[PDB]
Amino acid sequence: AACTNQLGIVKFLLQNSWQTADISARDSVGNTVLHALVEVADNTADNTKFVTSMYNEILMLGAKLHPTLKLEE
Amino acid sequence: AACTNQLGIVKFLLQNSWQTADISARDSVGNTVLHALVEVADNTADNTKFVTSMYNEILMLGAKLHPTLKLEELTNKKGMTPLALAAGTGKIGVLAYILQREIQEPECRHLSRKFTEWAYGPVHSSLYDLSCIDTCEKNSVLEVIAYSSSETPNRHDMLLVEPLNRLLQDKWDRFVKRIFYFNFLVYCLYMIIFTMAAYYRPVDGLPPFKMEKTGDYFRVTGEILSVLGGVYFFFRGIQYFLQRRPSMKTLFVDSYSEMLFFLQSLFMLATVVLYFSHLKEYVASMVFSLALGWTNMLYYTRGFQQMGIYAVMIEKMILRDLCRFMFVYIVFLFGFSTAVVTLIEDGSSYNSLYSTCLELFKFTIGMGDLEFTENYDFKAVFIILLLAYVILTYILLLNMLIALMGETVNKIAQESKNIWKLQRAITILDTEKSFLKCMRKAFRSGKLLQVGYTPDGKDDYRWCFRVDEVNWTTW
Amino acid sequence: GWTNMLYYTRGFQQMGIYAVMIEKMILRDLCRFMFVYIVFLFGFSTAVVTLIEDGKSSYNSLYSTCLELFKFTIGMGDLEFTENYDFKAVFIILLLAYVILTYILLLNMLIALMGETVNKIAQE
Ligand SMILES: CCCC[N@@+]1(CCCCCN2CCCC[C@H]2C(=O)Nc2c(C)cccc2C)CCCC[C@H]1C(=O)Nc1c(C)cccc1C
Ligand code: NA
């Protein structure tokens, strides 16, 4: 959801009622959501625009949900 | 009605109530309406605009009225399809439209030529139809663009349209690069054998020479191999002159490599003729065939991108800056040489036009002597003439030549790259068309994929070339 | 050793950019020019040595004649260095062709290409 520019869907998947996704869950290579978000960027205009935008969005969401978690480290 | 940008009248003439105009009707030349739409285009912006739009509309209408009619494939009396005609005549906007024609309407979607295949997330695979583009057919777009004469405009810019550049690069990287390198190596070996057979030539007596020592066996082997190489290049040049049937202007403006290799072969044959006629002069001919030989290796620089662009620039300078510079320079040099010889009394006797031209040319080299000067009668006149010659040619013309080359370089950055691409394209087509059936069909391009369903209902198989793309909008 | 002091030009902005441009030329332009120039020089040197009969500085060797034709590039060449052939016209034609191709065409074209490269690598 992050790497395909659905802000609504990621907001839902983080703040639903049935089951909320883990923000700091890592994949096979060990990437969080932020690592994959970085690795999808390719230094163009709109791509950089939305990657930076949703990077910021996920930072605010993580600060709200887990204020004691330093997601970026 | 179509060529005048009148959509309504076209729709009426096709979908009226009293008499419908035929859509496959042909004129005296045999051109259909699509051929005419192609010949109307002149590569300008608005013209290409409505020609593409009207081609689209009339093709869709032809599909709707006649789903069983392949309008795009109809040929005129030249057997020359609308795509083929657009390629040959040099209409680039129409070609760019046709080769990337993508139609959204599912009822006639089979018309299009660029098919998206899967669009997971932001990535798209695309198939470009290669029918009547690859060399396997006759009058293919690639062959027609490559073997086009000099007059056809946009000749080396028609080859940047998708998928043509990618298709040619795929042919190259897949099987043509290896063959080109092997040819390069064989030519290098031929030139080395020729060079070392020339270097150790016998110097005593008249030709031919009695093969006596052990090394003489090696030398006659090298001589034979050089003669075979020369005759092979001679016959290859003759085959070129027969295959392409080029005009005199085309020969003298756009076949320089073929002309040069042919000329070197001519020099080799003259060398053989003289050598078997007991003449020292054979060496002269042989020597020229040597120099050209090594020079001709710059041909193979087209296999490499940087060096290919470099050699293209070399040619552009030779053909446009150096020629005019040499004309002016010859005028000045001959004028002042005649003047100086007129001053000079009984002449290293410099009372001949050749010797004085040689001195005044030494001035251009950077080895000019101002003091071969004991044999005139007026020192002031002589030195004024020499200073005038120096200032005009050495200081003015040469630096002006440097400046003009700088300007030309700044002016042909892109044309050089396009010309190199076209040179490599000619190399690829010639290499491919010069093999056997087994290998040629063993290295066709693209797959025989399933596009979709023809309006008849059955499957549609098209030789499609696959291209991967990413887009960060239009989800 | 001495030509490694250009390394320390890093510490000064103008000289550092200058040395970076020197590197860029050596890699972009000089290599291509040298390849083409070597091809031409070797071809014409082989032709001239073949034409030249018994050398007896006895330029009937490939090395000495390559050196003689290289002298032209540095503005010090001699158009009549041997007199030891059988066809003066062929010798002169070859030397004039070499001078026109390399001294006039190639070297000035190299200057032009360095000019363009300077224009294009101002910020890099
Ligand atoms: C100036 C011709 C270059 C044009 N050419 C030929 C390149 C192969 C050998 C060229 N050699 C190599 C060295 C540099 C110059 C030249 C040469 O030997 N000079 C020369 C002479 C005449 C006498 C004595 C001594 C010398 C050095 C480039 C590639 C394809 C064949 C042809 C061409 O036709 N190119 C093209 C096409 C296909 C289509 C459209 C337009 C164009 C321009
Ligand atoms: Na000098």
Curated annotation (Swiss-Prot), chain B:
Keywords attached to this entry: ANK repeat, ATP-binding, Calcium, Calcium channel, Calcium transport, Calmodulin-binding, Cell membrane, Cell projection, Glycoprotein, Ion channel, Ion transport, Membrane, Metal-binding, Nucleotide-binding, Phosphoprotein, Postsynaptic cell membrane, Repeat, Sodium, Synapse, Transmembrane, Transmembrane helix, Transport
Effect of L260A: Abolishes response to inhibitor SB-366791
Binding site for resiniferatoxin: Y256, S257, T295, R302
Post-translational modifications reported in the UniProt record: Phosphorylation by CAMKII seems to regulate binding to vanilloids. Phosphorylated and modulated by PRKCE, PRKCM and probably PRKCZ. Dephosphorylation by calcineurin seems to lead to receptor desensitization and phosphorylation by CAMKII recovers activity.
Record text on activity regulation: Channel activity is activated via the interaction with PIRT and phosphatidylinositol 4,5-bisphosphate (PIP2). Both PIRT and PIP2 are required to activate channel activity. The channel is sensitized by ATP binding. Repeated stimulation with capsaicin gives rise to progressively smaller responses, due to desensitization. This desensitization is triggered by the influx of calcium ions and is inhibited by elevated ATP levels. Ca(2+) and CALM displace ATP from its binding site and trigger a conformation change that leads to a closed, desensitized channel.
Protein name as catalogued: Transient receptor potential cation channel subfamily V member 1
Record-listed Na(+) 2 binding positions: G366
Effect of L292R: Abolishes response to inhibitor SB-366791
Extracellular domain ranges by topology: 201-217, 278-280, 375-378
Residue spans of the ANK repeats: 1-22, 31-67, 81-104, 139-161
Recorded domain comment: The association domain (AD) is necessary for self-association.
Residues the record lists as Phosphothreonine modifications: T116, T427
Binding site for Ca(2+): D369
Recorded GO MF terms: ATP binding; calcium channel activity; calmodulin binding; excitatory extracellular ligand-gated monoatomic ion channel activity; extracellular ligand-gated monoatomic ion channel activity; intracellularly gated calcium channel activity; metal ion binding; phosphatidylinositol binding
GO annotation terms (biological process): behavioral response to pain; calcium ion import across plasma membrane; calcium ion transmembrane transport; cell surface receptor signaling pathway; cellular response to acidic pH; cellular response to alkaloid; cellular response to ATP; cellular response to heat
Modification Phosphoserine occurs at: S247
Expression sites by tissue: Widely expressed at low levels. Expression is elevated in dorsal root ganglia. In skin, expressed in cutaneous sensory nerve fibers, mast cells, epidermal keratinocytes, dermal blood vessels, the inner root sheet and the infundibulum of hair follicles, differentiated sebocytes, sweat gland ducts, and the secretory portion of eccrine sweat glands (at protein level).
Chain segments annotated as transmembrane: 179-200, 218-242, 256-277, 281-301, 305-343, 379-405
Binding site for Na(+) 1: G366
Family: Belongs to the transient receptor (TC 1.A.4) family. TrpV subfamily. TRPV1 sub-subfamily.
Curated annotation (Swiss-Prot), chain C:
Superkingdom in the source lineage: Eukaryota
Cellular localization per UniProt: Postsynaptic cell membrane; Cell projection, Dendritic spine membrane; Cell membrane
Extracellular face residues: 84-87
Position of sequence motif Selectivity filter: 75-78
Record-annotated membrane-spanning stretches: 13-51, 88-114
Any further remark recorded for this protein: Responses evoked by low pH and heat, and capsaicin can be antagonized by capsazepine.
Record family assignment: Belongs to the transient receptor (TC 1.A.4) family. TrpV subfamily. TRPV1 sub-subfamily.
Protein name, UniProt field: Transient receptor potential cation channel subfamily V member 1
Gene name for this UniProt entry: TRPV1
Parent-record interval covered: 548 to 693 of 839
